[PDB]
């Protein structure tokens, strides 16, 4: 009952300049190819954590596809390859921060060729899936087809907003979505999209949460059960409608991250903050994807959402310390240790909605 | 026999956005890969014109190399490939205007790994070459080793000034160099490098020539035999020590480019000699590769037995084909079109001195 991952397979071009990038000319630095795309990264992360995912995507019969598939050890029956299709490419120019200064995509092969027609071939896989994860690179039509299959079989759906623009695609599928994982810009865009108007616009944790609470409520009322807001270096917010456990390799995590840790019996809005762990950043790209991958893998292994999120945040830290979007391997003892640190450090927010 | 091409093999990455370039995230647009590097471009241009060159360069055993070499149909024995090497890449992110918003270049593989030691492996190739073409991407040591090998065997050397900065690498090898092909910024930079002081720092053709004559003479005084100043849309300037109608001292036993051009570009039409060659009006799609194909077209023509005046005309024709292509080098050359354009340039050529 493998988790099913649907979305983009992208060849990433990462340009980290030695000095500050200046207009009108090139500056010295390093430029690397990295296997990318939210869905590909999530699948890769889940696999390296010891769970086999099923990948549904589309690739070309070109050079970039041959880079992405060189060391691909998962099934490829879910991957649509034809010659008319041009493999998606994202080109990023970083700053010295490790943040993106300028990026271009690059990815309309996904919206045009990862169709409902292709996804419906795998109705059994989605139906029997432990979890369905879709990224917003999919078209509204593909997202509808995907999410309606999982809902039919009562399979929980994870929607990754990918960007501010593409996050608005939550609008037509919100009912079917169980979990979303936006940052604070994407959360705002999603809230605006469901509100049909531009009602929301993009410090301490209780300030940030109080500022995002109206936007979070919008998503919850539109049928989303769990909203995970990634706050980068100040961790993540886990917000859910009802008890977070009721909303939906790792027996180490189950041991040390006790499910009996949190005494709190079913609120309309549940909120708690997860801290992140200090890390030696080489590239922040892929951090969010590994959070999702780490979380899905744990949920797929029978852990609850609170335990799974800690694993996700652990995986995110490992990812920023690599020059890949997803690290070449995961060290389980490191993953478990970091997860416990995050888990034990998780605190609850907020007595009347 | 075969012309030897030594220099950079670069993967060019052009990111031209739909619009709205913003920090912190990817933005919609198109990203293209283009096989680049002056030497690689010259080699490709020469081959498509029906002459086989020998390429000496350095590449990695990575993804960029596999994109770069995918449709490479020439020998690879002159190309140093090792796991230590990361394939040179120039990554450019444009704005709506078409100017570079941010650019990063990682091309230190050429200067660090294309050593004199590697070049001396192909001493037989360089010695027996009809012509030797080196780009300024090479280190000074690599340039010295290559050009002194050619000088011993009296093999003509073509030095291509990659940029204003790298053009100054002519300083230690000017003695060995037969032909240089700078634009006028590069010509000034090379002149200053050769001089004991920095004496050099819209216009009509004989006016622009009269302004460049001192800088041109400097190069001539230092041993350069032929100076070709590329003037973009104002054609090219051909200045030489002695008669301009020079040819490659190679036995007759030719090809299709030779007897097409020779028929149509009569050799009976035509110290220091100076000519101006006009360019041909063209549908510019991208100026990419224009200078390189001017070099490529001229070398190819010289290699098939044409004189310098005939060869330069082909080069400007080839340069035109390159600007009306949007690969650095056009996918193919239509020899009839090249020949027709060459006659236009040839017949439009004017004596200045
Ligand atoms: Na990373
Ligand atoms: Na071009």
XYZ file of C-alpha atoms in Angstrom, chain A:
353
model
C 0.000 0.000 0.000
C 2.841 2.331 -1.004
C 2.354 6.096 -0.699
C 1.687 7.606 -4.128
C 3.614 10.715 -5.141
C 2.357 12.755 -8.102
C 4.083 15.833 -9.483
C 7.148 17.360 -11.097
C 10.477 15.811 -12.025
C 12.827 18.725 -12.626
C 16.465 19.146 -13.560
C 17.669 21.848 -11.180
C 20.432 24.240 -12.134
C 21.921 25.764 -8.989
C 24.236 28.750 -9.303
C 25.894 29.709 -6.020
C 28.053 32.767 -6.669
C 31.351 33.397 -4.890
C 30.525 37.074 -4.453
C 27.309 39.081 -4.703
C 25.625 38.651 -8.122
C 25.591 41.919 -10.062
C 23.370 42.964 -12.960
C 24.702 43.118 -16.496
C 27.469 40.541 -16.121
C 28.509 37.121 -14.846
C 30.352 36.645 -11.541
C 32.543 33.707 -10.390
C 30.865 30.868 -8.488
C 29.817 27.233 -8.748
C 27.018 25.898 -10.934
C 25.738 22.353 -10.404
C 23.050 20.021 -11.704
C 20.754 18.630 -9.027
C 17.825 16.234 -9.431
C 14.875 18.374 -8.369
C 11.127 18.860 -8.426
C 8.956 18.713 -5.312
C 7.451 15.288 -6.007
C 10.738 13.740 -7.142
C 12.459 15.076 -4.020
C 9.686 13.822 -1.738
C 9.796 10.392 -3.384
C 13.591 10.310 -3.133
C 13.483 11.352 0.532
C 10.845 8.750 1.423
C 12.848 6.037 -0.325
C 16.097 6.917 1.434
C 14.190 6.710 4.723
C 13.313 3.094 3.940
C 9.800 3.329 2.497
C 9.034 2.585 -1.160
C 6.906 5.268 -2.848
C 5.191 5.088 -6.227
C 6.108 7.917 -8.580
C 3.714 9.340 -11.152
C 5.297 11.954 -13.392
C 6.355 12.887 -16.906
C 9.767 13.179 -18.566
C 11.258 13.852 -21.982
C 13.490 11.729 -24.176
C 16.240 14.299 -23.790
C 19.481 14.881 -21.887
C 17.995 16.294 -18.653
C 15.706 13.264 -18.287
C 18.791 11.065 -18.639
C 20.432 12.930 -15.765
C 17.343 12.530 -13.572
C 17.034 8.807 -14.325
C 20.728 7.788 -14.186
C 20.551 6.371 -10.669
C 16.774 5.973 -10.513
C 16.050 2.747 -8.620
C 12.299 3.089 -8.195
C 9.589 1.884 -10.569
C 9.169 3.860 -13.797
C 5.796 2.529 -14.936
C 4.172 5.640 -13.474
C 6.464 7.944 -15.446
C 5.193 9.172 -18.828
C 7.964 9.524 -21.416
C 7.476 10.799 -24.969
C 9.645 12.689 -27.464
C 7.409 15.756 -27.839
C 7.848 16.398 -24.112
C 10.631 18.680 -22.901
C 11.979 17.744 -19.468
C 11.241 20.522 -16.908
C 14.193 22.736 -15.965
C 14.572 25.178 -13.071
C 17.455 27.651 -13.080
C 18.303 29.270 -9.751
C 20.767 32.006 -8.920
C 21.457 32.155 -5.239
C 22.846 34.867 -3.075
C 25.546 34.504 -0.404
C 22.732 33.857 2.090
C 21.908 30.575 0.369
C 18.529 32.109 -0.509
C 17.272 32.469 -4.071
C 18.064 35.820 -5.689
C 16.561 34.931 -9.082
C 14.912 31.771 -10.435
C 13.208 30.664 -13.662
C 10.872 27.719 -14.448
C 10.695 25.959 -16.758
C 8.014 23.364 -15.980
C 4.966 23.567 -18.261
C 5.536 20.002 -19.437
C 3.963 18.991 -16.122
C 0.806 21.073 -16.551
C 0.413 20.033 -20.179
C 1.402 16.364 -20.129
C 0.821 15.043 -16.613
C -2.857 14.752 -17.471
C -5.901 13.178 -15.798
C -5.773 10.660 -18.656
C -2.334 9.506 -17.518
C -3.031 9.530 -13.768
C -6.260 7.527 -14.135
C -4.217 4.589 -15.448
C -3.074 4.146 -11.851
C -6.453 4.297 -10.116
C -5.606 1.092 -8.238
C -2.377 2.540 -6.873
C -4.073 5.709 -5.636
C -7.018 3.700 -4.276
C -4.797 1.306 -2.319
C -2.321 4.018 -1.317
C -1.412 4.706 2.302
C -1.258 8.375 1.363
C -1.510 10.513 -1.767
C 0.856 13.431 -2.237
C 0.325 15.953 -5.027
C 2.316 19.093 -5.795
C 0.836 22.289 -7.231
C 2.830 21.881 -10.447
C -0.101 19.747 -11.540
C -2.866 21.532 -13.424
C -6.190 22.192 -11.702
C -7.656 19.404 -13.832
C -4.979 16.850 -12.904
C -5.306 17.848 -9.253
C -9.079 17.362 -9.338
C -8.758 13.934 -10.955
C -6.049 12.843 -8.511
C -7.724 14.126 -5.346
C -11.138 12.715 -6.260
C -9.698 9.225 -6.678
C -8.131 9.299 -3.217
C -11.272 10.748 -1.628
C -13.351 7.963 -3.201
C -11.127 5.384 -1.509
C -10.876 7.649 1.557
C -7.126 8.004 1.008
C -5.620 11.034 2.820
C -4.270 13.720 0.469
C -1.162 15.868 0.928
C -1.030 19.071 -1.130
C 2.285 20.919 -1.488
C 1.699 24.513 -2.711
C 5.159 24.756 -4.377
C 4.848 28.549 -4.812
C 2.667 31.593 -4.098
C 1.152 31.478 -7.589
C 0.607 27.715 -7.770
C -0.696 27.515 -4.187
C -3.941 29.102 -5.353
C -4.782 25.803 -7.072
C -6.003 24.613 -3.662
C -9.193 26.504 -4.555
C -10.895 23.730 -6.531
C -9.707 20.767 -4.435
C -9.804 21.957 -0.799
C -12.581 19.523 0.178
C -10.426 16.556 -0.856
C -7.228 17.740 0.828
C -6.232 16.420 4.254
C -2.839 18.089 4.719
C -1.226 21.207 3.264
C 2.348 22.365 3.870
C 2.688 26.029 2.859
C 5.154 28.680 3.972
C 3.678 31.977 5.178
C 3.400 33.526 1.713
C 1.741 30.439 0.246
C -0.621 30.260 3.226
C -1.716 33.826 2.495
C -2.196 33.148 -1.224
C -4.214 30.003 -0.480
C -6.437 31.860 1.983
C -6.993 34.604 -0.591
C -7.755 32.022 -3.282
C -10.421 30.323 -1.159
C -11.840 33.703 -0.159
C -12.084 34.591 -3.866
C -10.611 38.010 -3.018
C -7.293 39.524 -1.902
C -8.197 39.785 1.782
C -4.837 38.781 3.296
C -1.284 40.050 2.859
C 2.123 38.498 3.676
C 8.980 38.580 15.872
C 7.709 35.971 18.326
C 5.882 32.718 17.591
C 2.683 33.918 19.264
C 2.784 37.081 17.154
C 3.301 35.138 13.935
C 0.578 32.639 14.811
C -1.909 35.351 15.784
C -1.164 37.038 12.461
C -1.738 33.827 10.485
C -4.696 32.454 12.469
C -7.425 34.066 10.320
C -5.793 32.727 7.146
C -5.405 29.286 8.733
C -9.097 29.230 9.668
C -10.046 29.912 6.045
C -8.328 26.715 4.912
C -9.719 24.638 7.781
C -13.278 25.792 7.145
C -12.915 24.915 3.451
C -12.306 21.278 4.356
C -8.570 21.084 4.985
C -7.929 19.111 8.172
C -4.245 19.868 8.750
C -2.249 22.998 7.954
C 1.516 22.847 8.416
C 3.106 26.274 8.071
C 6.859 26.066 7.510
C 8.593 29.052 9.096
C 12.124 28.258 7.976
C 14.610 28.910 10.775
C 11.861 29.332 13.377
C 10.459 25.884 12.683
C 6.891 24.991 11.796
C 3.284 25.422 12.907
C 1.032 22.390 13.108
C -2.599 23.429 12.932
C -5.495 21.023 12.604
C -9.260 20.751 12.833
C -9.793 18.411 15.766
C -7.131 16.383 17.571
C -4.063 16.103 15.277
C -4.017 12.321 15.778
C -7.641 11.996 14.681
C -7.131 14.064 11.534
C -5.704 11.173 9.527
C 13.002 1.982 10.478
C 11.052 4.231 12.850
C 10.551 2.156 16.004
C 13.344 4.246 17.474
C 11.246 7.388 17.033
C 8.187 5.645 18.482
C 10.243 4.669 21.541
C 11.720 8.085 22.360
C 8.959 10.333 21.040
C 6.245 9.033 23.348
C 2.667 9.370 22.095
C 1.779 9.920 25.758
C 3.931 13.054 26.005
C 1.088 15.488 25.379
C -1.791 15.233 27.844
C -4.053 17.355 25.618
C -10.540 16.614 24.076
C -11.119 17.845 20.526
C -10.820 21.536 19.523
C -12.070 23.300 16.384
C -8.578 24.696 15.867
C -5.541 22.947 17.326
C -2.198 24.750 17.283
C 1.327 23.863 18.365
C 4.776 25.118 17.371
C 7.705 22.919 16.352
C 11.203 24.373 16.673
C 13.868 23.580 14.083
C 17.466 22.608 14.824
C 20.454 24.918 14.106
C 22.360 23.719 11.031
C 25.291 24.371 8.691
C 23.455 25.520 5.553
C 24.987 24.912 2.130
C 21.705 25.312 0.233
C 18.154 25.832 1.529
C 16.530 24.382 -1.612
C 14.780 21.083 -0.892
C 14.267 21.720 2.818
C 10.485 21.885 2.500
C 10.370 18.845 0.229
C 12.333 16.769 2.737
C 9.998 17.946 5.498
C 7.117 16.486 3.509
C 9.057 13.357 2.586
C 10.171 12.815 6.168
C 6.622 13.294 7.435
C 4.945 11.075 4.823
C 7.444 8.260 5.406
C 6.762 8.283 9.150
C 2.991 8.379 8.644
C 3.407 5.526 6.168
C 5.287 3.628 8.875
C 2.434 3.970 11.355
C 3.548 6.963 13.432
C 1.182 9.801 14.349
C 1.328 13.294 12.847
C 3.207 14.881 15.765
C 5.909 12.202 15.650
C 6.008 12.332 11.852
C 6.427 16.110 11.721
C 9.421 15.916 14.063
C 10.978 13.404 11.670
C 10.145 15.751 8.800
C 11.859 18.685 10.488
C 14.826 16.422 11.233
C 14.984 15.479 7.542
C 14.722 19.135 6.517
C 17.816 19.960 8.572
C 19.772 17.147 6.898
C 18.722 18.514 3.510
C 19.950 22.088 4.013
C 23.362 20.704 4.977
C 23.771 19.027 1.569
C 24.439 20.262 -1.957
C 21.588 18.054 -3.096
C 17.935 18.854 -2.588
C 17.770 15.449 -0.909
C 20.929 14.132 0.832
C 22.722 11.093 -0.707
C 21.779 9.108 2.394
C 20.005 9.507 5.731
C 21.661 8.666 9.045
C 18.857 7.136 11.122
C 20.559 7.802 14.461
C 20.962 11.457 13.471
C 17.372 11.544 12.217
C 16.089 9.992 15.447
C 18.165 12.244 17.703
C 17.131 15.440 15.934
C 13.509 14.318 15.860
C 13.509 13.840 19.632
C 15.015 17.304 20.117
C 12.277 18.837 17.969
C 9.579 16.627 19.504
C 10.517 17.422 23.103
C 10.778 21.084 22.137
C 7.309 21.277 20.606
C 5.022 23.655 22.493
C 1.288 24.320 22.274
C -0.283 27.628 21.276
C -3.329 29.415 22.724
C -9.512 29.419 25.394
C -12.155 30.332 22.822
C -12.049 30.536 19.027
